[PDB]
Amino acid sequence: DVAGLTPCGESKEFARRLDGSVKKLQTRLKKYEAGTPPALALQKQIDKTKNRFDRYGKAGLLCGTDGLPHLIADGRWSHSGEFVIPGLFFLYVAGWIGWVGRSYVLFARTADKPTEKEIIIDVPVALSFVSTGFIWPFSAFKEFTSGNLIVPADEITVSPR
Amino acid sequence: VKRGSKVRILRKESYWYQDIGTVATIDTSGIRYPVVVRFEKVSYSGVNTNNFSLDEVVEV
Amino acid sequence: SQFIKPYNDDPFVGNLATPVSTSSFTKSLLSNLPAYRAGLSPLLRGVEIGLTHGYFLVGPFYKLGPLRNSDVALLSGFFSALGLIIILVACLTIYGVVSFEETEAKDQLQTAKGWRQFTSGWLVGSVGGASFAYILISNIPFLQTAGMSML
Amino acid sequence: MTAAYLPSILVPIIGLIFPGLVMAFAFIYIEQD
Amino acid sequence: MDSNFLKYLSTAPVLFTVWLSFTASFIIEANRFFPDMLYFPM
Amino acid sequence: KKVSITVDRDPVATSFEKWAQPGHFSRTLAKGPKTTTWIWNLHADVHDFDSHTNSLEDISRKIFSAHFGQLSIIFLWLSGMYFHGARFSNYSAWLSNPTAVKPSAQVVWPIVGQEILNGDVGGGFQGVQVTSGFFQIWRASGITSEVELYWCALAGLLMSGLMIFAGWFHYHKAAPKLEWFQNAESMLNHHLSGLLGLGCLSWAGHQIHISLPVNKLLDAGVAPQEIPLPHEFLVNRDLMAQLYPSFSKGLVPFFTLNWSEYSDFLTFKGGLNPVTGGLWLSDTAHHHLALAVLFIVAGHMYRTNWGIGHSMKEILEAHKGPFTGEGHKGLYEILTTSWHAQLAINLAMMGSVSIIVAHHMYAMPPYPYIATDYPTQLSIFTHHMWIGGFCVVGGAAHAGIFMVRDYNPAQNYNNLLDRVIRHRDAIISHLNWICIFLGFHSFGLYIHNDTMRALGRTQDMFSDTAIQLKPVFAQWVQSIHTLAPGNTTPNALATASYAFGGDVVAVGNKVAMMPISLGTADFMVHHIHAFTIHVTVLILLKGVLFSRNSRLIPDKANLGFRFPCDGPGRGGTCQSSAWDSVFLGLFWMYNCISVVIFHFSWKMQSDVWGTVQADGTVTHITGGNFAQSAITINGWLRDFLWAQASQVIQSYGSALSAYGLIFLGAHFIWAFSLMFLFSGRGYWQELIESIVWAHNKLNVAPAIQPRALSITQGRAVGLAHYLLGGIGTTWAFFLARIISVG
Amino acid sequence: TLNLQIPSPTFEGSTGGWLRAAEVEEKYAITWTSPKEQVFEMPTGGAAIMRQGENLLYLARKEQCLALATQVKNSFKITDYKVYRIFPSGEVQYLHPKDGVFPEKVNAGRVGVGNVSHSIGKNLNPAQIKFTSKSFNG
Amino acid sequence: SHSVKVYDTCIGCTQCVRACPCDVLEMVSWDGCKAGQIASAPRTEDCIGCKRCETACPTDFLSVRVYLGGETTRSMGLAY
Ligand code: CLA
Ligand code: CLA
Ligand code: CLA
Ligand code: CLA
Ligand code: CLA
Ligand code: CLA
Ligand SMILES: CC1=C(C/C=C(\C)CCC[C@H](C)CCC[C@H](C)CCCC(C)C)C(=O)c2ccccc2C1=O
Ligand code: SF4
Ligand code: SF4
């Protein structure tokens, strides 16, 4: 398909991986009596293995000759859920986290003793800040455009050149 | 510059170069560095005050 | 009754007077060694020291060398001991060249002429002692097997 | 090997005589005043 | 609630441990109820 | 009276105020942070009580209560081990079939596929195999059910609560005075006679009255569920007297000194129990009873309120001769005023005792079915070896701390300490020379043998089929100890251990114990051990003796125990403190214990551990390769390191795969440690300057100014991650290998 | 001047004392007066007891003598100590305090050595003073 | 021998002279500071280079500076 890879739902070596995993769990299952809790645990592991391989085979994932799913990350939408959309989810969270941390830093400078606020967190104020992060891109961009995010170079300490 | 003012440091070798301090005392005698400036950030040696000349301090 | 005292009645020098360092036996043994014995030229000090060390140098080379299981073990061991003797003589020569300035004094070890005499004596004694050890092991079967010939 | 005596002549010389003289003369040079 | 005990609870190591355990519990329960998420499903 | 109880009531109010003020204990730290260095200083010096105050009484009270807190933690750990044995273990199935059921007392939850770590350990159970040896201890104690383990866990929890309550009471409500702590004679009398003596007596009672009948029934083949309860063994004298008839005679032979009547349950048999492969429990019962008698006798030595008893100050001051000046005068004041000297002595002794425990426990297995449990043996030997080495280096460290801080030259004039200081140069020079001699004539033998085997000269090697270095003295000692029963020990049925010589004790077709011969390789590795121990002694003793001053730094005591340097001057004075000597000696302790445990693992796997099959031949795990391979570094590299690491690197997809993961992770962290070890502070501080500029550009610079870790902290962090990585690598490799093949 | 006949503190000796370079290259001397006989720590390792009155001691390094001086200053309140340098030829060079007044106190007649008339950030770059004997200070 | 320089940012606190283990620095009269004194280094042949004076100096970036140079018996701290 892409890059000569085959879909996992028709790959014979993907089926060989699934069969090998199922037999490897079943040979452990063979040594326990039916109804024993290890037997139930092993059968649950077999069910999870079968469900995982079934789910992976019907997802449009591409499998190489090894028998494992291979991710496509060139920007194409047919694999846009493999790298692009989870990454944006991280981009949602991480841009949240730094922003609320930045907000707390701007709060902490205004206190009587900032370092005590640094080691001993103001928990209601911190919870307010971590609540504020849900609209972080627009808030951060408005902070940037109003000159409150970037400071000029003449107010930052630098070493002698 | 005067007593109480916030000043920026233009001494290149200083730890607080382009940072803001508060003037604590201006000596009137013929001292090369008569402006005592106290800083909120401590240096690497743990001090937070230093003497500077008139041209090494600019009011903000 | 204290057995450990300051060295030379100086408490601030970096040494202590101990039974191992300053007893009568230790002083007698050190003063009777050729390196410290009075009335000896440096040449004769070299001769005695070289005879002793060159005599004992033959043994390990003969008994543990790569040719020890061959018929020429003693000859190889003596030749190796002689090569070690020549190397040590070169060490003595360069030590005396770099350590002393040329002075008239020649009756002390720590002079240029005295050290050259000591090196000459050490070479001649080392060759003589190694040759004597070679002769004795060659001519006595007890030394060839290091005592298993009695069993 | 043509001129097979040359390894057995030169390898002991290069490996024992050359470094011994080099170390001795370099010692004399670096320790003299 | 004693205010000094609350201030001790508001210290960086205690809150750090509690928040990282809370985050780990989110990841653990998410992977328990929705396992094997190699991908965003289409 | 002179020995009395003095206590101050309510000295410290119980409050949460200082809980909210980090650094309250230190006047420097109570001002609050300005740099990130403050945080590290807060966590590094917190339990260093003597640097916060000069009052010895408050320091001693803090020490006493911190010891109570540690005892509470240890009791909580023991209660946890008993509870996890009770609820999450296969202990009954192991009790039914000890030779075929792997002990396991840890069960994982299935979350991300880690349920694969619940391996098939036998007995219809799945879990993580445990090697702490608790199953054998509980079998030796007579625990036959998990209900008793539940009750043991409850007792441990109650004792943990009692210890933590005692800590709170004895610091915060009733704190003893300094005069109470400064009774060495009373403390030794009570701790010798009451702690060790009555403890040994009560455990001998438990062994005789509970452990012996239950274990005798277990070795006879009775199932655990039909064995009578211990209180039935207490009250039914007939039930005991079927097994040990001397109990029919009661306590009359004890009080009438007719003790040989008790010869059936107090024995001196020696050797090992053939059914279980452990020591005879009657031998242990007489042993602990004799230890109880000896300790209670030793606990009446020291002078107290009544006139009888020895005075240790008089004993110390009486022992002086012509070679030693004032002799042992002044040491009693040192050990009754400085806590650090006592910590040095006690850490040194606990480390040596742990090492003795490791040796004497592999060689004489004391528990039933622990000898053929090869992972348990390897685990407890390696663990107690490491604990012993750490405690010895800590004794040296805290000796150096005493030397820097608490030593007073005015009170130490011409005593043994002063004379040791006054010939420190002779000591360090002679020890340095003997260390170089040991290094040459031990390690150059391995290098020489590697070169000879590489040069194709096998007849020039140091081996048993070549020029020999025979360990004649140790072999002679082994011959004496094998000949000892009936000649110098007439009342012993068997030898103290079969490692000196004798028969092959095998349990369930696996070797419990066999003779351990000593050849050229054993000679070389024991002299390697002597070399490494002498070099560690050189480092630690040189650090201790030069802790106060040297020819380099004449005022080193003013700088303190722990400083990075005295500047780049005098050529460079880096790592001049005693702390840095401890820092290097920890590396050398790691090397020494690593070589010791490698010798142990290879020698037991090659010459002792294995399977017994028909015609009485013993097939060892590695087939006797130690004699010809442990004489070269290449043999250690290939036949021990390369060969036995196959199990940890092929463990993926099995129950031991976690060890492989830990193997890789330790390999990671150790290498990460070198980033601290090889680098210096200025580079990281300037990089932190650039990162601070980056955070300043977005106005997100913290108020607490970030600083690089201190030079001492850089060394300590590198050493800690190095030790963690190396010990974890050896841990994973040893455990995966010995679980797989043994 | 250094009185060679001043008695020494009572010391049992140690291995930390001065080596051959003291009698060959240079040696240092420290004298001081104590109000009583009292035990002090030697800077070379070990305890010695100083006598009441004057005490003369020989060391290998100046820093050892000044460490002893600091020790007796902060532990015995002795400030009259004098440190001399002695050569094998017998010439004695008085070292500390050089003009009789301790160096942390200003004394008249002292001249400044090594003083630079600008701040440290006004030193020259090496590129001005490469292939030139001009100093980096200006 | 090491080279020790004193720059005119010195405030005359006498800490560097008190921190010196080798008696290299001393305080001389000066008019550039309120204390009326400046540090000086007349005895840099005894300087070992330990930089205790630089550690002791309280002025933002140091007024007393030690430049390590040619090593001698005194500067190497050799008792032999
Ligand atoms: C015979 C009396 C006796 C006994 C048994 C002990 C026992 C102990 N002392 Mg000790 N001590 C005594 C008298 C005694 N002391 C006296 C008279 C003094 C004053 C001179 C001291 C001063 C002293 C100091 C200063 C310190 C100790 C410490 C310790 C503990 C060492 C750690 C250890 O091995 O714990 C494991 C051993 C155990 C037995 C664990 C159980 C712990 C509890 C407390 C035992 C209680 C037994 C009880 C009396 C009998 C009930 C048993 C049965 C009838 C149910 C240990 C619990 C150290 C410590 O850790 O303090 C907290 C310590 O720093 N002692
Ligand atoms: C408030 C949080 C915060 C924010 C917004 C930033 C912002 C920045 N950091 Mg920084 N940093 C922080 C905390 C923060 N830092 C901490 C705590 C550390 C110590 C581990 C570092 C260590 C660090 C290094 C070593 C580097 C940066 C770099 C950077 C820049 C690029 C982003 C990056 O690499 O992030 C990656 C961030 C990290 C690897 C560390 C983050 C640690 C946690 C996750 C953040 C703290 C969250 C905080 C606890 C929330 C509490 C608030 C709550 C009370 C409301 C950017 C200026 C890089 C740079 O210079 O790029 C130009 C760089 O090389 N930072
Ligand atoms: C740098 C080049 C080089 C190197 C590494 C070697 C290496 C070797 N030669 Mg060889 N050789 C070389 C050039 C070189 N050769 C040249 C150019 C000639 C022609 C004259 C020879 C002729 C030669 C003979 C006839 C023999 C060897 C032999 C050997 C072996 C033993 C060493 C010895 O006795 O040297 C002896 C070498 C010489 C006397 C000639 C000097 C080598 C060149 C001219 C000098 C190069 C020096 C270099 C550029 C500067 C180094 C500076 C500093 C690092 C010291 C060894 C494998 C011996 C052998 O076969 O043993 C198995 C032997 O018998 N060589
Ligand atoms: C490339 C340099 C080089 C060369 C050519 C050799 C050559 C040799 N080594 Mg060797 N060796 C070397 C480097 C070298 N080595 C290094 C670097 C080491 C240290 C790891 C060793 C350590 C070593 C050991 C430990 C031994 C040898 C031995 C031998 C000899 C092999 C056995 C035999 O048949 O001799 C039989 C021996 C002899 C015929 C004696 C030769 C005596 C010579 C000819 C005297 C010359 C003295 C001197 C060079 C004169 C000039 C002085 C001047 C340099 C100042 C052989 C002559 C073995 C041996 O037999 O030596 C006793 C042996 O035991 N070597
Ligand atoms: C009986 C045990 C014992 C006791 C009571 C003490 C007590 C003390 N020691 Mg000592 N020490 C000991 C054993 C002991 N030590 C041993 C065995 C060693 C050798 C390693 C040392 C080495 C040592 C040094 C080198 C120093 C001390 C110091 C101190 C003092 C302050 C300690 C402090 O504040 O740390 C506070 C507590 C900590 C910093 C916690 C340490 C955490 C460690 C480093 C990491 C643990 C890793 C963990 C086990 C595994 C995690 C891995 C996982 C993440 C995968 C205090 C008097 C210091 C001092 O100032 O003395 C005057 C000092 O310089 N000791
Ligand atoms: C494998 C690496 C290695 C080696 C070989 C050494 C070697 C040494 N260390 Mg070291 N060390 C190491 C790693 C190593 N260290 C590491 C990683 C640390 C980290 C903390 C330390 C920390 C450390 C401390 C803290 C101390 C040492 C000490 C010593 C010396 C002990 C004396 C001795 O055994 O002499 C025997 C020499 C050897 C075993 C080296 C190999 C020599 C063999 C015999 C072959 C000889 C061949 C021959 C010379 C070749 C001639 C050929 C010719 C061309 C030159 C020795 C020089 C101690 C010391 O110096 O006190 C005496 C000491 O105090 N080291
Ligand atoms: C890397 C390194 C540093 C840098 C280490 C920095 C300064 C300290 C790192 C501590 C971090 C901040 C805490 C643990 C990191 C966590 C994984 C994530 C941080 C969590 C934040 C919320 C604090 C040194 O300071 C250093 C000093 C001396 C010799 C070698 C070195 C050295 O190698
Ligand atoms: S480097 Fe040391 S010896 Fe030199 S002037 Fe500074 S403090 Fe004095
Ligand atoms: S320490 Fe610094 S500021 Fe103080 S006198 Fe010396 S040079 Fe001047």
Residue numbers in the entry:
A (entry chain F): 28 to 188
B (entry chain E): 2 to 61
C (entry chain L): 2 to 152
D (entry chain I): 1 to 33
E (entry chain J): 1 to 42
F (entry chain A): 11 to 189, 192 to 754
G (entry chain D): 4 to 141
H (entry chain C): 2 to 81
Can you quote the paper on this entry?
PSI-ACPIs were purified from Rhodomonas sp. NIES-2332 (Materials and Methods section), and its structure was solved by cryo-EM, which showed that it contained two supercomplexes, one with 14 ACPIs and another one with 11 ACPIs. The structures of PSI-14 ACPIs and PSI-11 ACPIs are solved at resolutions of 2.08 and 2.14 Å, respectively. As the PSI-11 ACPI structure has also been found in the previous study (Zhang et al., 2024a), we consider that this represents a form of PSI-ACPIs present in vivo, but we cannot exclude that a part of ACPIs have been released from PSI due to detergent solubilization during isolation, leading to the observation of the PSI-11 ACPI supercomplex. PsaQ is a hydrophilic subunit located at the lumenal side, with a four helices-bundle structure similar to that of PsbQ found in PSII. Interestingly, it binds a Chl a at the membrane surface (a302/Q), which is close to PsaB but without an amino acid residue as its ligand. On the other hand, PSI-ACPI purified from cells grown in the S-phase does not contain PsaQ (Zhang et al., 2024a), whereas our PSI-ACPI structure contains PsaQ, suggesting that our cells are in the L-phase.
Photosynthesis converts light energy into chemical energy by two photosystems, photosystem I (PSI) and photosystem II (PSII). Among them, PSII splits water and generates electrons, protons and molecular oxygen, whereas PSI transfers the electrons generated by PSII to nicotinamide adenine dinucleotide phosphate, producing reducing power to be utilized for the subsequent CO2 fixation. Both PSII and PSI are composed of a reaction center core associated with outside antenna proteins which function to harvest light energy and transfer them to the reaction center. Different from the red algal antennae, cryptophyte LHCs contain a unique carotenoid alloxanthin (Alx), as well as Chl a/c2, which are therefore termed ACP (alloxanthin and Chl a/c binding protein) (Zhao et al., 2023; Mao et al., 2024) or CAC (Chl a/c binding protein) (Kuthanová Trsková et al., 2019; Zhang et al., 2024a) instead of LHC.
